């Protein structure tokens, strides 16, 4: 289950973090790691569609070529506080499972700005029972953490040096879908 209120930054700049671009998970901190980890690649697409708030995520696991694509509209908690319903989906957008009220997650804007980001987020997905998640993320994917975001995790009273880098695997991501997904 997950424990945390993330506070959003002050001044979060909604139209600059969801342009419409791509943000590569680098490092991330799960709370309730299982007892053997998946050690998956990740990444979003955050833009605004039609006037919809939208998400698009990856999910790759560069051992068991585990592969799935999501699309959510997101809905305002409040400014950098997101509650987001996903739909899975293949990469060209045509649903796999199809929205559904226990299967959410809750996404929280911790520190942005133009290359970098810290985010939190809480998975809900049926009657699974998962743990907070937090994730670095930057515009560029082997990006190593600058000085901004590593100060950030500090002023959260988290330890960086506990976060598990996604570096050194061996991912690759399909930038392209995510974009388009936006729309779907
Ligand atoms: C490198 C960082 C990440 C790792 C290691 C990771 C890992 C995973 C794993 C193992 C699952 C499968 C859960 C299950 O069904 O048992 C999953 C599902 C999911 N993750 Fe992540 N995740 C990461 C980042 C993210 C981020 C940043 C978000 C939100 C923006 C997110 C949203 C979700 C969603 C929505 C699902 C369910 C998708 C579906 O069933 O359609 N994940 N993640
Ligand atoms: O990656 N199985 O939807
Ligand atoms: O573990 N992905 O929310």
């Not at 649903?95 to 929280?108: D, E, L, S, W």
């Not at 994917?141 to 976060?163: C, H, I, P, Q, Y």
Request: charged share 25%; with cysteine; net charge neutral.
């Amino acid at each position: 289950a997950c424990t945390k209120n993330a506070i959003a930054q002050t001044g979060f700049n909604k139209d600059k973090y969801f342009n419409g671009d791509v943000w590569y998970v680098t490092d991330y901190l799960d709370l309730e790691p299982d007892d053997v980890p998946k050690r998956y690649c990740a990444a979003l697409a955050a833009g605004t569609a039609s006037g919809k708030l939208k998400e698009a995520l990856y999910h790759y696991d560069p051992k068991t070529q585990d592969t799935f694509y999501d699309v959510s509209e997101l809905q305002v908690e409040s400014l950098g506080k997101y509650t987001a319903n996903f739909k899975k989906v293949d990469k060209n957008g045509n649903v796999k499972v199809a929205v559904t009220a226990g299967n959410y997650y809750t996404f929280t804007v911790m520190y942005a700005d133009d290359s970098s980001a810290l985010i939190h987020t809480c998975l809900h997905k049926g009657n699974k029972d998962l743990g907070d998640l937090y994730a670095v993320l930057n515009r560029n994917k082997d990006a190593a953490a600058g000085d901004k975001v590593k100060s950030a995790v500090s002023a959260a009273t988290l330890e960086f040096s506990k976060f598990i880098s996604t570096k050194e695997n061996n991912c690759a991501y399909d930038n392209d879908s995510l974009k388009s997904l936006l729309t779907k």
